[PDB]
Design a protein around this ligand. Structure first.
Ligand SMILES: COc1cc(-c2nc(C)nc3[nH]c(C)c(C#N)c23)c(Cl)cc1Cl
Length: 219
């Protein structure tokens, strides 16, 4: 009897400083956790800038999709909030290199800044705003598709390690989906009014369409 599907899964250890940062973020009390959404939307915007830039000299880069946008998808039943863009996306090497195994100088620098009295809301200036997801999420899954490459899924519950595998569930044209599996006491970020007010407050200058899709699985 053959399996419906099979995926090779790799587990990698986080670089020491990244593990340190994740533990600080996911455990420490902060009063302004809503900034995570600003940081994720900012990373979407950057990724959309990148594919747009590439398309200026090579229009075929948009064969995987011309529309450049950001979607926000709360799912109360799964207790997940997902941010999706049609940006440049990432290769497997990109995921392994840029989401865990190699720590840029900004990682240690950010933790130093916090020790010196800086606020968590500055985290994007250090290039590690992604990890602010763990302010509100117990687990984060990143599904990504780059041109000419297959679709991958990165995942971590911040245990000091993350996994990478091929993802074949729902094929994306191009871009990145960040799925936040929210902590039990952070479900306010699934509410329409909360999402709207955070986007209005922090993302006014993002130069791409941002669209809410409220998700409900029907009985
Ligand atoms: C600059 O650092 C990062 C950037 C990214 C990222 N990259 C691309 C190419 N697209 C994206 N879209 C979203 C919504 C991201 C987020 N968050 C994101 C990720 Cl997943 C982790 C880190 Cl650490």
């Amino acid at each position: 009897d053959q399996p419906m599907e099979e995926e090779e899964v790799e587990t990698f250890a986080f670089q020491a400083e990244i593990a340190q940062l994740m533990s600080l973020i996911i455990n420490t009390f902060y009063s302004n956790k809503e900034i995570f959404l600003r940081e994720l939307i900012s990373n979407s915007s950057d990724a959309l800038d990148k594919i747009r830039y590439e398309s200026l000299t090579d229009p075929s880069k948009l064969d995987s999709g011309k529309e450049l946008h950001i979607n926000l998808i709360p799912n109360k039943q799964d207790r997940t909030l997902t941010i999706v863009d049609t940006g440049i996306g990432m290769t497997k090497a990109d995921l392994i290199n840029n989401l865990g195994t190699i720590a840029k100088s900004g990682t240690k620098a950010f933790m130093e800044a916090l020790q010196a009295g800086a606020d968590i809301s500055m985290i994007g200036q250090f290039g590690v705003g992604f990890y602010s997801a763990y302010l509100v999420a117990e687990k984060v899954t990143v599904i990504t598709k780059h041109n000419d490459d297959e679709q991958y899924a990165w995942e971590s519950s911040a245990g000091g390690s993350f996994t990478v595998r091929t993802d074949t569930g729902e094929p994306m044209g191009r871009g990145t989906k960040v799925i936040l599996h929210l902590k039990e006491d952070q479900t306010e970020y699934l509410e329409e009014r909360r999402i709207k007010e955070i986007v209005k407050k922090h993302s006014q200058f993002i130069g791409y369409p941002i669209t809410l899709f409220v998700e409900k699985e029907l009985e």
